[PDB]
Structures are given as structure tokens and as C-alpha cells.
Symmetry: C4
Subunit: 24 residues, 4 copies
């Protein structure tokens, strides 16, 4: 994938991690 | 979104996650 | 900084995955 | 956004490593 797509995918994963930490 | 901007967002979230683990968790 | 941006991206993606995996099993 | 994309990525990589170490200790 392109660098922009990988950054967008990386941002999505950080959002998922944040949600898990808030609800842990 | 530009690369520098998208990076800034990512960097924002990492500092938020790093701060919670280091101090808030007990 | 010898490593290519893509290579650095792959390392970041791997670390994210490991982080998520550990978080989910908690 | 003064720093270069390669340096910012490396910094982002570093923070990810710190986050993984903190999560495992919990």
C-alpha cells in the first residue's frame, strides 16, 4: 500500500487501542 | 489529510496513550 | 536514518499489532 | 510540523516501544 494508506491504517489502529484503554 | 497533519494526529494519540500508562494506571 | 520510510512503517505496524493483541487479551 | 517525516516516524516508533513495555508489565 501507499504511505498515506498505511498512515490512515495506523491511525485507525491507534483509535482502536485508545477505545480499548478507555474501556479496560 | 496531508502526511504531516496525519502524522500530528498519530503523534497526538501516542502521547495521550503514553501519559495514561506511565501515571494514571495503578 | 538508514532504513527506508516504508521499512520503518512496517516496524510501526508490527508494534501496533502486538500492542492490540496484548490489549484485547486483558 | 517542523521535524522531517523520517525523524517523526522514528520518534513515533520509539513511543510505540515504550507503550508495549508498559502494557506488558501491568
Amino acid at each position: 500500500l501507499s504511505i498515506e494508506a498505511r498512515l490512515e491504517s495506523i491511525e485507525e489502529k491507534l483509535s482502536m487501542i485508545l477505545g480499548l484503554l478507555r474501556t479496560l
